[PDB]
Amino acid sequence: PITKEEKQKVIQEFARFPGDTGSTEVQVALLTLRINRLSEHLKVHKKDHHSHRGLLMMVGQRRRLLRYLQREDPERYRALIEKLGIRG
Amino acid sequence: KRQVASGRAYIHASYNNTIVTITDPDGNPITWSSGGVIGYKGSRKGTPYAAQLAALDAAKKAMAYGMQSVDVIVRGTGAGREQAIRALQASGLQVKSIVDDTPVPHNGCRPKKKFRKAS
Amino acid sequence: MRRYEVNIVLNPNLDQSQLALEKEIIQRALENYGARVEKVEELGLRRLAYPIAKDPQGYFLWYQVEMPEDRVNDLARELRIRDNVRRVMVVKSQEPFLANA
């Protein structure tokens, strides 16, 4: 699983400021975490579809936030991406 | 020929027949009767009367071995399970106890159609 | 790592010699798999509701270690290899849920 601690180090490394948790980056951050975990898992448990839908959704919500991002501040966006590993 | 004195009586009832087995305390059968044995063939083989007769036969035959007391053990719901348990009590043979040991799986093999339809 | 209550039921006909040997192996194992023994209890011989391995009884060992999840199965895997060892139930810990209180 993802440890409370593990999770926190994420929020820190992304929050727009002290006490920031739900900013459109932190979230895109948190999701990337869950995605890379799930993605991993399913790499091994190929027949575990019920889990895969959870992913198909996670990847969805992310793609949706990033969209919003690239529309209200193409910088934070263009900044978040390069900061993460989305794109190529 | 062995003088077993105290034994164990198995009553295997069923809708089609009632076979009775008398064994020693270890479980090795001494004697045995049944619908067939007693003379009834086919259908009446399993009536409760047949049961009665069969039950009694098992006792008598087992009496020679010197049998006097015995623990009855039942299996099956067949028509006739009771009479057997009755006769076996009124055969002199001291019926120490009675038990239901009818086996039942914890859901194992697909029963024959006649026994499914349970869904 | 997490708290797992370990259970073991081994042959009741053991001489002190043969016995200590097995317990020794239980440690050899538990230790080999990052298992810190928070505690233990040894009820010993108990009348089983049904015979196990033809034997009408069994000697019980109850622990409570704290170890890496990624192990446990291996732990029990190994912990079972022994012959005198008849059962191993590595249930995970859980704070009690009282009732009629």
């Binding site: - | 039942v74 348990i85 106890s97 009675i98 038990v99 239901d100 040991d101 914890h106 | 259970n7 039921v9 009820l43 108990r46 089983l48 509701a49 049904y50 196990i52 069994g58 109850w62 059962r87 139930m89 249930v91 859980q94 009690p96 849920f97 009282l98 009732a99 009629n100 209180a101």
Partner: protein
């Protein structure tokens, strides 16, 4: 039927998760190794459900029976 005494009333406070407490678990088992219903165990949905999981562990360990023979018939 069921109107006996409620296998819970006649008992004190106890950890429903204790899978070694044969001396209490046993009480929840029928005349046979069958788990008693709520109308007899007097427990609640949640309670009864945790019991079950317990009595089942007890059975694997060997402290509780999976089945017993009926006496008298």
């Amino acid at each position: 039927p069921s109107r006996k005494a409620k296998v819970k009333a006649t008992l004190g406070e106890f950890d429903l998760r204790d899978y070694r407490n044969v001396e209490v678990l046993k009480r929840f088992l029928s005349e046979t190794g069958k788990i008693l219903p709520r109308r007899r165990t007097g427990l609640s949905g949640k309670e009864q459900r945790i019991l079950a999981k317990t009595i089942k562990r007890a059975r694997i360990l060997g402290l509780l029976p999976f089945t017993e023979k009926l006496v008298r018939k």
